[PDB]
């Protein structure tokens, strides 16, 4: 297994949806990366400045919808891309 | 398919097919946008055949009234047009809204004949049309 | 439903009005983006330095006036577009 | 009514002189924009570190003279254009 | 009469020299623009974190030496040019 440190992440972006709003079928640059995926590691939390660590309030198995930036950056684990990238990216969760 | 003409041309095209058709140009000096066309703003037809060269529209769905609306409008055009290449464009556009489009080729083993008889056809149309047009003595 | 983290705020954003100071119709570029939405989601609230989390002085139903940027993102949720965008871009609470 | 929030305060920036030092009227841009405006509302401070809110220096009714920037922001209330910007900004209090 | 807030100070700006070690006239780009003015108005001091606010050291009276830049900002008041700038351009007081 691989653990982050502090308040990072790992998540799994999900596939791009080919058919949006019918059965018409999206191909080319108008498809975009999708913005939401699946927390699979969580760490410990973040460090205060007097000293004590915080949890996270994200939890894993919840669907997360994240920015991609300069922060984010994706890594090959176990012949899978994932993603490391900080808490603070993090938007919002779904249901 | 891509729209004939160019410039002012092309509009004149768009127009014309709208109202054989009985459709709307979804352009953005007149105020709306292409998101916002709905099934009213397309037109109807009946056969549409496209090949490596030419398109045809067959059997246009559209009242009567708009299409002799709109020849009425060339034809008024017409009558205040200069040169001769306008003259024949606009008449090109009243033959396809209203009437239709002849050619006629003609055979010949050479060129010299070729061109010959071209000519001797050409007066003849010519000559057809006059008469048609004034009567014959 | 959709739920933010921290101190950011989901907005709806309103219609762009097309009548101004009387029946003429503005179309183009003279009709900006509406600056204005209405509040749906909003987060537990801020961390502080110490550790405490403070509420959220907008509340959920109000009307809001906030300044487009960087910050502000735009997302596709239930086949609508809504804005995930921080607490520090909102300006002004309509009534 | 519009209330801000923590430390934006809504000013009415005062119409541009026409008349300098006598009856030579100033047409075009040699007539700058005025730099003073009328406070019209007043949120209700900024937000401390530690957490504790602590009120403006600067009350409704008193004549402001404000320095323009990036964070000054013009909007249409009422059909009438009001700025809204940060305490910050505030330069000096006029009597 | 107009006073600062915060950390603000009012000055004046005094008259370049003319003559500069002697008798000879100095006009043009060489006489530079004087970086000595009179404090006119003192704010109540600045803000710390705790909330607590502590009053400036330059007194009005004083001359002062300050350094142009893009935080000063030229004022007309009374029909006379003053400058409205933070006291950490402050530099040194004369005597």
Chains 1, 3, 4, 5 share one sequence.
Do not use: W
């Amino acid at each position: 297994n691989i653990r982050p440190l502090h308040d990072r992440v790992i998540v799994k972006r999900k596939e791009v949806e080919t058919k949006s709003a019918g059965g018409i079928v999206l191909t080319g640059s108008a498809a975009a990366k999708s913005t939401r995926g699946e927390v699979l590691a969580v760490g410990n939390g973040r460090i205060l400045e007097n000293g004590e660590v915080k949890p996270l309030d994200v939890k894993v198995g919840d669907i997360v919808i994240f920015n991609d930036g300069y922060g984010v950056k994706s890594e090959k684990i176990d012949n899978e891309e994932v993603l490391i990238m900080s808490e603070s990216d993090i938007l919002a969760i779904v249901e | 398919v891509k729209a004939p003409g160019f410039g002012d041309r092309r509009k004149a095209m768009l127009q014309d097919i709208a109202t054989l058709t009985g459709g709307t140009v979804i352009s953005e000096e007149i105020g709306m946008e292409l998101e916002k066309a709905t099934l009213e703003d397309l037109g109807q037809a009946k056969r549409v055949v496209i090949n490596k060269d030419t398109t045809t529209i067959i059997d246009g769905v559209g009242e009567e009234a708009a299409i002799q609306g709109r020849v009425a409008q060339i034809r008024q055009q017409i009558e205040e047009a200069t040169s001769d290449y306008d003259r024949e464009k606009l008449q090109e556009r009243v033959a396809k809204l209203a009437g239709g489009v002849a050619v006629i080729k003609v055979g010949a083993a050479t060129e010299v004949e070729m061109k010959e008889k071209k000519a001797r056809v050409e007066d003849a149309l010519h000559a057809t049309r006059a008469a048609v047009e004034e009567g014959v003595v």
